[PDB]
Amino acid sequence: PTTTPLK
Ligand SMILES: *[C@H]1O[C@H](CO)[C@H](O)[C@H](O)[C@H]1NC(C)=O
Ligand SMILES: *[C@H]1O[C@H](CO)[C@H](O)[C@H](O)[C@H]1NC(C)=O
Protein backbone atom coordinates (compact mmCIF):
# COMPACT_ATOMS: atom_id res chain seq x y z
CA PRO A 1 0.00 0.00 0.00
CA THR A 2 1.58 3.23 -1.22
CA THR A 3 0.32 6.57 -2.54
CA THR A 4 1.63 9.93 -3.72
CA PRO A 5 1.73 13.15 -1.65
CA LEU A 6 -1.97 13.95 -1.40
CA LYS A 7 -3.21 15.74 -4.52
C1 LIG B 1 -1.15 8.71 -0.26
O2 LIG B 1 -2.56 8.75 -0.15
C3 LIG B 1 -3.05 7.79 0.76
C4 LIG B 1 -4.58 7.81 0.71
O5 LIG B 1 -5.04 9.10 1.08
C6 LIG B 1 -2.57 8.16 2.17
O7 LIG B 1 -3.10 9.42 2.53
C8 LIG B 1 -1.04 8.22 2.18
O9 LIG B 1 -0.60 8.70 3.44
C10 LIG B 1 -0.56 9.16 1.08
N11 LIG B 1 0.90 9.14 1.01
C12 LIG B 1 1.61 10.23 1.30
C13 LIG B 1 3.12 10.11 1.13
O14 LIG B 1 1.10 11.30 1.64
C1 LIG C 1 -0.44 11.01 -6.29
O2 LIG C 1 0.03 11.28 -7.60
C3 LIG C 1 0.07 10.12 -8.40
C4 LIG C 1 0.71 10.48 -9.74
O5 LIG C 1 2.07 10.09 -9.74
C6 LIG C 1 -1.36 9.63 -8.63
O7 LIG C 1 -2.10 10.63 -9.33
C8 LIG C 1 -2.03 9.36 -7.28
O9 LIG C 1 -3.40 9.04 -7.48
C10 LIG C 1 -1.91 10.60 -6.39
N11 LIG C 1 -2.45 10.32 -5.06
C12 LIG C 1 -3.41 11.07 -4.54
C13 LIG C 1 -3.84 10.71 -3.12
O14 LIG C 1 -3.90 12.03 -5.12
Closest ligand 2 atom, CA of 6?
Answer: 13
* Ligand closest in space to the Cα of 7: 2
Q: Ligand 2 centroid vs 1 CA: distance in angstroms?
A: 13
Method for structure elucidation: NMR
Please report, as a single letter, which amino acid is at residue 7: K
DSSP assignment letter at 3: -
2 within ligand 1 shell (Cβ under 6 A): no
Compute the distance between CA of residue 4 and CA of residue 2 in angstroms, rounded to an integer.
7
> Does residue 3 have its Cβ closer than 6 Å to ligand 1?
yes
Instruction: Say how far apart CA 7 and CA 4 lie, in whole Å.
Output: 8
